[PDB]
Amino acid sequence: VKLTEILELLVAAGYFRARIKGLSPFDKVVGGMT
Amino acid sequence: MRFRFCGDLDCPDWVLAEISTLAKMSSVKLRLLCSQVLKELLGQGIDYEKILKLTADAKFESGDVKATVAVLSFILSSAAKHSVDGESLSSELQQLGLPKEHAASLCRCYEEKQSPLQKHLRVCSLRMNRLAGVGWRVDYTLSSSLLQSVEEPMVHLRLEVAAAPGTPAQPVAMSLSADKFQVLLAELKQAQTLMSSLG
Amino acid sequence: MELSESVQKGFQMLADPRSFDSNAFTLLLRAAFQSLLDAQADEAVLDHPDLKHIDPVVLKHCHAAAATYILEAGKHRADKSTLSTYLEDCKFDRERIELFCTEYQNNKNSLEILLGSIGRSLPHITDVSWRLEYQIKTNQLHRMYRPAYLVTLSVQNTDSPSYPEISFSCSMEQLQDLVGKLKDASKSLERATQL
Amino acid sequence: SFLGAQLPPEVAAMARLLGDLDRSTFRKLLKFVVSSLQGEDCREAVQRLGVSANLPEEQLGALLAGMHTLLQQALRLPPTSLKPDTFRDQLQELCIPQDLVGDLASVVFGSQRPLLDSVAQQQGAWLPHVADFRWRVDVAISTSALARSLQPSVLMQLKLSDGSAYRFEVPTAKFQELRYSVALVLKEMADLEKRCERRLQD
Amino acid sequence: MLLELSEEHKEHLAFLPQVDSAVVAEFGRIAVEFLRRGANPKIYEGAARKLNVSSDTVQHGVEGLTYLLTESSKLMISELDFQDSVFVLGFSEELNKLLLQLYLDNRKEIRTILSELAPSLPSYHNLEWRLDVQLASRSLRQQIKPAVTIKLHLNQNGDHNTKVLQTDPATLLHLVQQLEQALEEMKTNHCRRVVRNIK
């Protein structure tokens, strides 16, 4: 899965809920963009 | 998402942020730093010189240090508040993304001091007042201008009461008739019987 | 519940058919409750024409005994089983045991509201209000550009000298901290309902 | 919605009680809510209404709490931001009966509103205000330390709305600093108003 | 926008070009040291004898230089507007560049000190809470009366004050609701425009 590229970006932005192991990929990506 | 050490709540965003600052230390010095904060929670003082001396490993700036001590104090106090075991704490810190070696180290120090922590946290729990001590004198009255012979005992009480730790006790001083004293002592004994039924 | 020898002797005289008939027992018992609960200090509360044949030293002694037992039974949340036990000990008959319980039950709620109104307590918070301002300038510093909250609590108690409003200011971090503390407190009330 | 993102529990409770309530009693209650907002003590009149309607105090409390919250949140909105059509629509999503909606709308938009606005504006104050300001201007001719002084000063006395009062003397070098400071703040209030009208109003 | 240097303030600063820039660097050091710690007039008579000028000449130059840095930091004047302000004084590029760096090095620290001067309102420090149930009194022997005991800690003028208070459960649910609506306001479009435009 290609998520690692964009989740590295969201963490580097300071959206740390991309680190939580338990949320679904949609919540991480779309939540982080919001 | 909800966590036991957070009190059956989702993790605060400042805690989840600064958990990523803990990962920046070695696991060997994250464990040493826990010991310094935990000593302070146990009332044994804190060694800022040592804290700064070891965190130079990671080249922390003083804003990193402040945030690191704050989050360790939160995690350890709040696990002890809710009586969370180190087994649960390790598993659920890992869910937040703390590395497994850092999770380990952090919880093997909590496991050692869990019991004395909770005894101290009960002593620190909110009080309005504390009775620091009692003094008393009993007098016998012989005669007066107001009554030619009296021949009655009288009591003086002084109660030392402390509003906050590290402060001198306030004295409450008063005088009582022997009738007022008798009824006061009898009432306090009834209160004590009820207290003993609760714990 | 303990009762002094003075109170017990007063009840032993109420238990007599000779000293008090069933009529006088009812009228004195009603006067006992009235003198406890009425806001009027009715000094003639004992001047009922059917009570007039009783020795006024005995009458006023049994009236204070009754009132004292009523307050002690009330304080200790006495159930009818407790009341009936003590009355039969004082040699009451089945008719007067019924009469005492009937009057006590009628007045029980008023007595318990009275006993519970006595005390002192902390200042009670009753309301809150807030202002949001954006900080522009000081005579020493330009471009402050930070929000502040101005909070006031309304307290409503007079058990000790006090001032009715507590005012303080919060930054964004201080108000977020404060709200978290009050929600932590509120979450503990919820847990206590699971007991 | 003007009630925010999630409906307050007291408003949801009240809105289901309204289905059982006679409109005569509703309009009696609404007067007590409005007059309480204007600061009038109503506790004894509410109690008489309770026994008159045969409402238990558990239901009075729920009704009064729910009505107060709804009016508080609506009356705090400017007429640009809540208007009769959108208010009426939003209240119908609560399933409030339409006749009671008309009574509520008359309170928020009718001739009651200007007195409510006046009371709501009083609550922005947090620090005390000047209630009175008196002075005298004196010249000292002689003093223990100087055969001739000839030096002016201003004695000032302030009374604040707090009920506090202060009497103090001002050197003329200190009066010049005070006068300068006050005129400066007045310039900077006027500049701030012009920033707001040209950027926040559009 | 630009600094309006008064004629006396200009006349004090006119000492700066009269001596080597290495001495002006020393004036810069001692200037910010006084802002940091407090002034010590005993140095002015030392520099006076070293420079063959009066002690008032040293004092005026240095205290004028401190005011230049203080007013620049108060305004947060830009580097471009700073130069346009300073070029009313005639001295050469080397001194102009020295002063600009001395400003930008220190404006953030000075602004921290200048923030302490504002009108001193009381402010929140901390809150403690305890869930109490009252079970008996002298007058009435069985009860359940739940209350939240609150201890509110406040600052003013650097002095801590504490107030002990009480709420019932339903009032505590009202308190959270109202102060959550307070925090929600900063997210509304109205307050967003203020933050966006008043800058």
UniProtKB/Swiss-Prot annotation, chain A:
> Where is the protein found, in the record's own terms?
Early endosome
Highest taxon of the lineage: Eukaryota
What is this protein's function per UniProt?
Answer: Component of the commander complex that is essential for endosomal recycling of transmembrane cargos; the commander complex is composed of composed of the CCC subcomplex and the retriever subcomplex. Component of the CCC complex, which is involved in the regulation of endosomal recycling of surface proteins, including integrins, signaling receptor and channels. The CCC complex associates with SNX17, retriever and WASH complexes to prevent lysosomal degradation and promote cell surface recycling of numerous cargos such as integrins ITGA5:ITGB1.
Q: Quaternary structure per UniProt?
A: Component of the commander complex consisting of the CCC subcomplex and the retriever subcomplex. Component of the CCC (COMMD/CCDC22/CCDC93) subcomplex consisting of COMMD1, COMMD2, COMMD3, COMMD4, COMMD5, COMMD6, COMMD7, COMMD8, COMMD9, COMMD10, CCDC22 and CCDC93. Forms a coiled-coil heterodimer with CCDC22; this heterodimer interacts with the guanine nucleotide exchange factor DENND10; the interaction is direct. Interacts with WASHC1. Interacts directly with WASHC2C. Interacts with SNX17 and SNX31.
Can you tell me which family this protein belongs to?
A: Belongs to the CCDC93 family.
Q: Can you name this protein? A: Coiled-coil domain-containing protein 93
Source organism of the structure:
Homo sapiens (Human)
Covered residues of the complete protein?
A: 25 to 58 of 631
From Swiss-Prot, chain B:
Question: Where would I find the COMM domain in this sequence?
Answer: 130-199
For this protein, the record's InterPro entries field holds: COMM, COMMD4, COMMD4/6/7/8
What is the tissue localization of expression for this protein? Ubiquitous.
The entry's localization annotation reads:
Cytoplasm; Nucleus
**Coarse class of the protein's main subcellular location:** cytoplasm
Q: Which Pfam families match?
A: COMM_domain (PF07258), COMM_HN (PF21672)
Tell me the keywords, alphabetical order. Cytoplasm, Nucleus, Transcription, Transcription regulation, Ubl conjugation pathway
GO biological process annotation, one example: signal transduction
**Gene Ontology annotations for the cellular component aspect, listed alphabetically:** cytoplasm; cytosol; intracellular membrane-bounded organelle; nucleus; plasma membrane
How does this protein assemble?
Component of the commander complex consisting of the CCC subcomplex and the retriever subcomplex. Component of the CCC (COMMD/CCDC22/CCDC93) subcomplex consisting of COMMD1, COMMD2, COMMD3, COMMD4, COMMD5, COMMD6, COMMD7, COMMD8, COMMD9, COMMD10, CCDC22 and CCDC93; within the complex forms a heterodimer with COMMD8. Interacts with RELA, RELB, NFKB1/p105. Interacts with CCDC22, CCDC93, SCNN1B, CUL2, CUL3, CUL4A, CUL5, CUL7.
Q: Which family does it belong to?
A: Belongs to the COMM domain-containing protein 4 family.
Q: What is the recorded function of this protein according to its Swiss-Prot or TrEMBL entry?
A: Scaffold protein in the commander complex that is essential for endosomal recycling of transmembrane cargos; the commander complex is composed of the CCC subcomplex and the retriever subcomplex. May modulate activity of cullin-RING E3 ubiquitin ligase (CRL) complexes. Down-regulates activation of NF-kappa-B.
PANTHER family cross-referenced by the UniProt entry: COMM DOMAIN-CONTAINING PROTEIN 4, COMM DOMAIN-CONTAINING PROTEIN 4-8 FAMILY MEMBER
Q: Spell out the protein name for this chain.
A: COMM domain-containing protein 4
Taxonomic source organism: Homo sapiens (Human)
Swiss-Prot record, chain D:
Q: State its location(s).
A: Cytoplasm; Nucleus
One GO cellular component term, please give it. cytosol
Stretch forming the signal peptide: none
| Tissue and organ expression note | Highly expressed in heart, stomach, jejunum, kidney, liver, and adrenal gland. Expression was generally higher in adult organs than in fetal tissues, particularly in heart, kidney, and liver.
State where it is primarily located. cytoplasm
UniProt keywords (A-Z) are: Acetylation, Cytoplasm, Nucleus, Transcription, Transcription regulation, Ubl conjugation pathway
Of which family is this protein a member? Belongs to the COMM domain-containing protein 5 family.
Query: Quaternary form?
Result: Component of the commander complex consisting of the CCC subcomplex and the retriever subcomplex. Component of the CCC (COMMD/CCDC22/CCDC93) subcomplex consisting of COMMD1, COMMD2, COMMD3, COMMD4, COMMD5, COMMD6, COMMD7, COMMD8, COMMD9, COMMD10, CCDC22 and CCDC93; within the complex forms a heterodimer with COMMD10. Interacts (via COMM domain) with COMMD1 (via COMM domain). Interacts with RELA, RELB, NFKB1/p105. Interacts with CCDC22, CCDC93, SCNN1B, CUL2, CUL3, CUL4A, CUL4B, CUL7.
Q: What is this protein called?
A: COMM domain-containing protein 5
State the organism named in the record: Homo sapiens (Human)
Curated annotation (Swiss-Prot), chain E:
Keyword Cytoplasm listed: yes
COMM domain ranges (all copies): 123-190
Q: Does the keyword Nucleus apply?
A: no
Localization, per the record, is: Cytoplasm
- InterPro entries documented for this protein: COMM, Commd2
- Per its UniProt entry, which superkingdom is the organism in? Eukaryota
Q: Which tissues does it occur in?
A: Ubiquitous.
Record keywords, A-Z:
Cytoplasm, Transcription, Transcription regulation, Ubl conjugation pathway
Indicate the principal place this protein occupies in or around the cell. cytoplasm
Pfam families on file = COMM_domain (PF07258), COMM_HN (PF21672)
Question: Which GO terms of the cellular component aspect does the record hold?
Answer: cytoplasm
What the record says about family reads: Belongs to the COMM domain-containing protein 2 family.
Q: How does it assemble?
A: Component of the commander complex consisting of the CCC subcomplex and the retriever subcomplex. Component of the CCC (COMMD/CCDC22/CCDC93) subcomplex consisting of COMMD1, COMMD2, COMMD3, COMMD4, COMMD5, COMMD6, COMMD7, COMMD8, COMMD9, COMMD10, CCDC22 and CCDC93; within the complex forms a heterodimer with COMMD3. Interacts with RELA, RELB, NFKB1/p105, NFKB2/p100. Interacts with CCDC22, CCDC93, SCNN1B, CUL3, CUL4B, CUL5, CUL7.
Report the protein's function: Scaffold protein in the commander complex that is essential for endosomal recycling of transmembrane cargos; the commander complex is composed of the CCC subcomplex and the retriever subcomplex. May modulate activity of cullin-RING E3 ubiquitin ligase (CRL) complexes. May down-regulate activation of NF-kappa-B.
Q: What is this protein called?
A: COMM domain-containing protein 2
Provide the species name: Homo sapiens
Query: Where is the organism placed in the taxonomic lineage, from the top?
Result: Eukaryota, Metazoa, Chordata, Craniata, Vertebrata
